[PDB]
């Protein structure tokens, strides 16, 4: 039986949700719609509810809506956000215009927990191990975040973490330089770069690359990692592209031990492996988990990978109505987790 729904205005938008979700409180806007904290009267737990913004307005919005719902329905890991529920106030495909997604709230994001504090080495080990374990899983399904930052990390009172907003792509401080140089031949280690920026900041209490704009962001990144070496310059196919980066003023690579003074030598070594300018030489999520830095947390028998994920829809050029219908079927066939 279809639950009883109720209307409420929040941030100049109507929210129509089942009666099971009580006390909606706005927590901000997060990936193509706003998010409310709510109390789930069925479980007694606190949930995050997202109302997608104009999900079937255009073709881009309709495909993005399908992409997100398909991703959420597949993702089943401790350090990756999962779907608790998906609903629409619509009674038919014809009336179907709104999509709401329900996940765990955890408590807060990584920014409100760290709040620019210099964290202890063991605390950093726990936080980074969790992000990496989550990324290993996401990456094994051929899914990348491409915009990982502290605000996409939902964290518990016990510092248990879940990654949010992966597979869909604000601050540019955690962005891989290859994305900003628009190399468009990049791999899964764009996420590893972001992990490196986060880890350095948790260790030092300061943003590693706090650029003021697009130009300044690259300038700051190249000051630490250096201008591209001979090996990386040979890999640039377009001469216009090779002429652009080799005009950003030469910079030698800094020794990280002379930058992160007093830090655990194993933390310095892992940062060297995470913040390599050449994406082909940058460490993977799986390799990073096996690094000596995580010796206390690493368990090769409890670092699972994802089941095969069918994302052939990505190559398809369909009409709004076809993406809408495909999304509707995914809503009605949703099985809540145990
Ligand atoms: C926006 C500000 O939010 C906060 O400050 N937050 C603090 C804790 C917290 C927990 C969850 C959320 C949140 O956005 N949840 C969510 C994620 C996805 C998601 O990750 N989707 C992509 C495809 C994988 C889809 C649906 C929801 C409900 C926000 C949260």
Pull the structure tokens for residue 122. Answer: 């063991």
Cα separation of 137 and 286, whole Å? 9
CATH number at residue 38: 3.30.200.20
Pull the structure tokens for residue 156. Answer: 């518990």
Catalytic residue (choose from 165, 213, 216, 302):
165
Cα separation of 31 and 90, whole Å? 22
Pull the structure tokens for residue 259. Answer: 């930058």
Burial of 104 (0-12, 13-18, 19+ CB in 10 A): middle
Say yes or no: 86 and 31 in one domain. yes
Resolution in units of Å: 2.5
Pull the structure tokens for residue 316. Answer: 């398809």
165 lines ligand 1 (CB under 6 A): yes
Catalytic, 165? Answer yes
Q: 31 Cβ partners below 8 Å, 6+ apart? A: 50, 68, 164, 165, 168
Looking at the CA of residue 29, tell me the nearest atom of ligand 1: 1
Q: Within the chain, where are the H helices?
A: 59-74, 110-114, 121-140, 177-180, 190-204, 214-225, 230-233, 239-245, 265-274, 285-289, 320-332
Cα separation of 300 and 318, whole Å? 41
Say yes or no: 103 and 200 in one domain. no
Pull the structure tokens for residue 10. Answer: 């929040």
Q: Whose CA is nearest to atom 14 of ligand 1?
A: 30
Say yes or no: 148 and 275 in one domain. yes
Pull the structure tokens for residue 257. Answer: 């031990």
CATH number at residue 250: 1.10.510.10
Distance 71 CA to ligand 1 centre (A): 13
Domain around 236 = 108-305
Say yes or no: 122 and 86 in one domain. no
Say yes or no: 286 and 324 in one domain. no
Per-position DSSP letters for 122-145, written without gaps between them: HHHHHHHHHHHHHHHHHHHTT---
Say yes or no: 33 and 66 in one domain. yes
Say yes or no: 299 and 327 in one domain. no
Cα separation of 338 and 34, whole Å? 27
Please name the method used to determine this structure. Answer: X-ray
Say yes or no: 78 and 144 in one domain. no
Cα separation of 72 and 166, whole Å? 10
Say yes or no: 114 and 187 in one domain. yes
72 lines ligand 1 (CB under 6 A): yes
Task: Output DSSP code: residue 54.
Answer: S
Say yes or no: 199 and 289 in one domain. yes
- Domain count for the chain: 2
Per-position DSSP letters for 316-329, written without gaps between them: ----HHHHHHHHHH
Say yes or no: 17 and 82 in one domain. yes
Say yes or no: 156 and 170 in one domain. yes
Cα separation of 271 and 219, whole Å? 19
Task: Output DSSP code: residue 150.
Answer: G
């Amino acid at each position: 039986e279809r639950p009883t729904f109720y209307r409420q205005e929040l941030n100049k938008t109507i929210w129509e949700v089942p009666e099971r979700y009580q006390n909606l409180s706005p927590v901000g806007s997060g990936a193509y719609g706003s998010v409310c904290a709510a109390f789930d009267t069925k479980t007694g737990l606190r949930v995050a509810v997202k109302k997608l913004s104009r999900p079937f307005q255009s073709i881009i919005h309709a495909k993005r809506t399908y992409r997100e719902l398909r991703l959420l329905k597949h993702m089943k890991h401790e350090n990756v956000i999962g779907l608790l529920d998906v609903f629409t106030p619509a009674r038919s495909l014809e009336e179907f215009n709104d999509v709401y997604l329900v996940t765990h709230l955890m408590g807060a994001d990584l920014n409100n927990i760290v709040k620019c504090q210099k964290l202890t080495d063991d605390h950093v080990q726990f936080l980074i191990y969790q992000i990496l374990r989550g990324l290993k899983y996401i990456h094994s399904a051929d899914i990348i975040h491409r915009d990982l930052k502290p605000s996409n990390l939902a964290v518990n009172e016990d510092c248990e973490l879940k990654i949010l907003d992966f597979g869909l792509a604000a601050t540019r401080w955690y962005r891989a330089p290859e994305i900003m140089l628009n190399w468009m031949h990049y791999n899964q280690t764009v996420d590893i770069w972001s992990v490196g920026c986060i880890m350095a900041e948790l260790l030092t209490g300061r943003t590693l690359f706090p650029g003021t704009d697009h130009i300044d962001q690259l300038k700051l990144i190249l000051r630490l990692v250096g201008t591209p070496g001979a090996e990386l310059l040979k890999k640039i196919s377009s001469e216009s592209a090779r002429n652009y980066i080799q005009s950003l003023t030469q910079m030698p690579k800094m020794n990280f031990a002379n930058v992160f003074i007093g830090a655990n030598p194993l933390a310095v070594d892992l940062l060297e492996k995470m913040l390599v300018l050449d994406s082909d030489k940058r460490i993977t999520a799986a390799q990073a988990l096996a690094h000596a830095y995580f010796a206390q947390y690493h368990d090769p028998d409890d670092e699972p990978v994802a089941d095969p994920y069918d994302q052939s829809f990505e190559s398809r050029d369909l009409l709004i109505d076809e993406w809408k219908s495909l999304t509707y079927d995914e809503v009605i066939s949703f099985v809540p987790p145990p």
